[PDB]
Design a protein around this ligand. Structure first.
Ligand SMILES: Cc1cn([C@H]2C[C@H](O)[C@@H](COP(=O)(O)OP(=O)(O)O[C@H]3O[C@H](C)[C@@H](O)[C@H](N)[C@H]3O)O2)c(=O)[nH]c1=O
Ligand SMILES: Cc1cn([C@H]2C[C@H](O)[C@@H](COP(=O)(O)OP(=O)(O)O[C@H]3O[C@H](C)[C@@H](O)[C@H](N)[C@H]3O)O2)c(=O)[nH]c1=O
Ligand SMILES: Cc1cn([C@H]2C[C@H](O)[C@@H](COP(=O)(O)OP(=O)(O)O[C@H]3O[C@H](C)[C@@H](O)[C@H](N)[C@H]3O)O2)c(=O)[nH]c1=O
Ligand SMILES: Cc1cn([C@H]2C[C@H](O)[C@@H](COP(=O)(O)OP(=O)(O)O[C@H]3O[C@H](C)[C@@H](O)[C@H](N)[C@H]3O)O2)c(=O)[nH]c1=O
Ligand SMILES: Nc1nc(=O)c2c([nH]1)NC[C@@H](CNc1ccc(C(=O)N[C@@H](CCC(=O)O)C(=O)O)cc1)N2C=O
Ligand SMILES: Nc1nc(=O)c2c([nH]1)NC[C@@H](CNc1ccc(C(=O)N[C@@H](CCC(=O)O)C(=O)O)cc1)N2C=O
Ligand SMILES: [Cl-]
Ligand SMILES: [Cl-]
Ligand SMILES: [K+]
Ligand SMILES: [K+]
Ligand code: NA
Ligand code: NA
Ligand code: NA
Ligand code: NA
Ligand code: NA
Ligand code: NA
Ligand code: NA
Ligand code: NA
Ligand code: NA
Ligand code: NA
Lengths: 397, 397
């Protein structure tokens, strides 16, 4: 029969990849979001992917006319009315644990509201906003320093997994539904947060200001900015100024210290740029003193360069190792899927210093991954006729 | 030593009454709120009470100068700075379970935020807003149809009890303190709710609209008003309009039915006036059909007249009994402390029908209570020379 995937980002791409891999006799169609103009970013363009993989792209209007189909929305942008289809085989993933957090900005509102957990829900599409009956859902805790970005990436991951787990049952029709409860049902509109005039209310407690700071931390979109300083995390102090909330107690290149309703807060200026630059050639000790939060070690720039990617490209071995010891993925990738091993290969080639590879292989470096173009490090070295290096790399298990 | 009670309402009055009763060698002073102009309302005027009981009223500025004193704030309206006293014996009751819900409108915000519980906290005054170290606190659950009024009255009650329980330890100095945690500390300002332009957001779920309706239900101040109809409670329906949230599906004299993000809602128009009038002379059956929520049976007008008070004054015996069966207090009082028994005495006198008293005594009618002037039903009948009726009433245990 036919399966129409309507949506965006790594959820739509990874679900579709799984279907291609796993489900043979299934005719795939794509419906893409209006603002998907084919550019990969922190998330892949589903439009680009579909064009490359010969998945036909159709309009939402075309989708209404397809009979013997199942329709699955994955972060789709247009309202879907069940009355416009011949069938009821119309499914959505919504990034919350429904019935809570229907609607918008689900990576922010749970954090703003100091929730202990969130989740992802697979449900039927009905006429209204995230209102249809629940087919499956999974919960997870929010971390103490969860940000909207870290939360969104959880969503992408769990939602991909829920879709894969349930898809055979969606296809067969062998699934159960439960109507959403009215109790603890909640919704937020597009008007609920104005991302283009974002204000942190400083006439609040230390905890409430830091929850806001974190709920608004999503580098690709923005960082919170206070007193003309971009902020990347902070901490609650033990001191309690008598000054009114919002008073700036201290401002320098490193941080802002503010008085609040209760405890003073220290808000760390963003120094990610300086952290990436340090990873070229500075020691772990140097970097450990530059950073004000270890969360900065996991950040990525617009290309997806992380600290480890910089350290690998530059052959900064002590930094690579130290990053791995702080829980950084030795097989990290940029936004094109290009891996640590590929960046390190370039350093090997440029430098002629092949001595560090074994160390990294022993830390779990994977030479066999492929980038978004489907090429491994081996494919590149072959294409470029770098046979000595290809052969040296090939000796490792 | 000296004890200064700074504040308002039945909490300040009842605490002070307990002290007068229980603590002999204690010199009392009062500081009253700027807007306490001596008028009893749903709460007693502490100013009136102090003048009548010869408790000297002093300014806050006078209070700073009293040495060998303890200072206790009970819903006081002016900021207290610990630096202005010779001593640290400065205590506050705050109507929340701190560190949550510092600041304003604590009868509303927990309801708006769908909390499962609230509480009351006794703590030291420090320079900031409800920030000082905790001496004691008690928690309680919020009812499913809790309103800001029912919540406030809980607060008054539990806070009076916490003060009475802890006062000897405050006086002796033999109490423990714990600093408030930063975690889960929250605050709301006067700006957080505009009671003079109160808007219910109807682009929300059924549950969220009803939480707002209830958080804004406090008859003495206001009822929520939608489409020019005063609302007193409502219910979530099983129907789900396709129309956009806020669409009025039905409007008549009884109710408004609205479409929401999820389930339709029925909002009951306020008919308290009609309920009081019915209690004069109509049957329980009649009233049971007039009411749309049994919460209406417990409501009071600006004098403190409840349904039972009306039924008693009018000798509506079946209604009195039926009210008691619905959990109404047979010893209910108006805002001057005047009891059901007093109102029923007037009906006895007016009518010459003494036959129903025994029935009420058997349901728990208390002839021995005193009003805010310190007079019982017996005192009134003696003053008015109604000796036959006095003597008839006197035969009951
Ligand atoms: C637009 C925007 C978003 N964010 C955060 C908050 C948001 O939850 C997360 C992902 O943003 P996104 O996918 O635009 O939008 P959102 O989570 O509201 O998703 C909503 O719109 C999409 C198209 C619907 O399918 C979805 N079901 C909705 O929840 O990033 C920001 O931090 N800054 C922004 O400017
Ligand atoms: C991390 C890093 C990269 N570069 C260069 C090297 C790279 O070709 C160019 C753009 O980076 P990119 O978009 O992350 O590279 P891409 O995903 O196109 O991958 C390419 O370059 C890498 C180095 C090869 O191993 C890989 N086989 C190529 O496809 O920037 C730098 O100059 N400095 C750096 O720190
Ligand atoms: C003014 C106002 C209040 N309310 C509700 C909400 C509020 O929590 C409750 C009692 O009102 P109130 O005592 O004026 O004020 P509130 O609870 O903000 O108390 C605040 O101000 C007093 C003076 C401080 O001592 C206290 N600690 C504060 O919490 O009634 C309404 O429903 N409508 C109103 O217009
Ligand atoms: C409940 C009720 C009362 N009344 C009258 C009777 C009352 O004197 C007057 C004002 O009511 P109130 O302020 O509640 O009365 P108050 O607290 O001053 O008490 C007085 O009147 C009552 C009836 C006596 O038993 C009591 N001993 C008096 O002090 O209104 C009515 O006309 N209709 C009523 O339904
Ligand atoms: N029936 C249905 N319900 C949904 O919740 C839903 C779908 N379909 N399809 C995909 C996506 C679409 N979500 C939306 C949500 C709002 C608008 C919209 O145009 N809203 C108004 C009001 C804005 C607001 O309040 O957010 C607008 O003027 O923009 C469009 C698509 N979505 C589930 O993810
Ligand atoms: N140190 C101290 N802290 C308190 O929280 C407190 C006291 N004392 N004393 C009694 C009462 C007084 N509460 C208040 C709170 C705000 C304003 C005030 O004037 N606020 C500003 C801003 C308004 C707002 O944000 O609420 C104003 O302009 O009105 C006055 C008294 N109160 C605890 O109950
Ligand atoms: Cl190469
Ligand atoms: Cl009398
Ligand atoms: K402060
Ligand atoms: K609706
Ligand atoms: Na993209
Ligand atoms: Na199911
Ligand atoms: Na917005
Ligand atoms: Na702006
Ligand atoms: Na550091
Ligand atoms: Na009063
Ligand atoms: Na204690
Ligand atoms: Na206000
Ligand atoms: Na108004
Ligand atoms: Na009824």
């Amino acid at each position: 029969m036919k399966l129409i995937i309507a949506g965006k980002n790594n959820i739509a791409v990874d679900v579709t990849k799984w279907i291609i891999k796993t489900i043979s006799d299934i005719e795939l169609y794509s419906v893409c979001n209006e603002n998907d103009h084919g550019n990969d970013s922190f998330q892949l363009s589903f439009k680009k992917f579909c064009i490359q993989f010969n998945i036909p792209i159709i309009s939402l209007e075309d989708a209404y006319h397809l009979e013997d189909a199942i329709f699955l929305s994955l972060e789709f942008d247009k309202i879907i009315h069940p009355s416009k289809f011949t069938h009821n085989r119309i499914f959505n993933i919504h990034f919350s644990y429904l019935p809570a957090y229907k609607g918008m900005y689900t990576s922010a509102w749970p954090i703003l509201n100091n929730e202990q957990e969130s989740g992802v829900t697979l449900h039927k599409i009905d006429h209204g906003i995230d209102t249809g009956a629940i087919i499956d859902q999974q919960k997870f805790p929010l971390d103490i320093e969860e940000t909207a970005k870290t939360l969104y990436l959880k969503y992408i991951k769990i939602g991909t997994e829920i879709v894969i787990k349930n898809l055979p049952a969606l296809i067969s029709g062998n699934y159960s539904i439960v109507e959403q409860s009215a109790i603890k049902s909640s919704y937020y509109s597009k008007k609920s947060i104005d991302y283009k005039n974002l204000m942190i209310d400083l006439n609040k407690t230390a905890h409430e200001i830091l929850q806001q700071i974190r709920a608004f931390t999503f580098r690709d979109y923005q960082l919170p900015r206070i007193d003309d300083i971009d902020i990347f995390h902070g901490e609650i102090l033990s001191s309690k100024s008598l000054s009114k909330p919002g008073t700036i107690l201290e401002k320098n290149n490193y941080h802002l210290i503010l008085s609040t309703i209760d405890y003073d807060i220290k808000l760390y200026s963003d120094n990610f740029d300086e952290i990436l630059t340090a990873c070229e050639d500075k020691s772990p000790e140097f970097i450990s003193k530059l950073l004000k939060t270890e969360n900065i070690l996991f950040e990525k720039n617009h290309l997806g360069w992380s600290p480890i990617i910089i350290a690998a490209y530059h052959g900064n071995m002590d930094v690579i190792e130290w990053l791995v010891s702080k829980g950084v993925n030795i097989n990290d990738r940029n936004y094109k899927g290009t891996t640590v091993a590929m960046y390190f290969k370039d350093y090997m080639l440029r430098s002629g210093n092949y001595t560090g590879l074994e160390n990294l292989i022993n830390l779990g470096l994977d030479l066999f991954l492929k980038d978004n173009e489907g090429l491994s490090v081996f494919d590149y070295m072959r294409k470029n006729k770098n046979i000595e290096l290809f052969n040296f790399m090939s000796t490792f298990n």
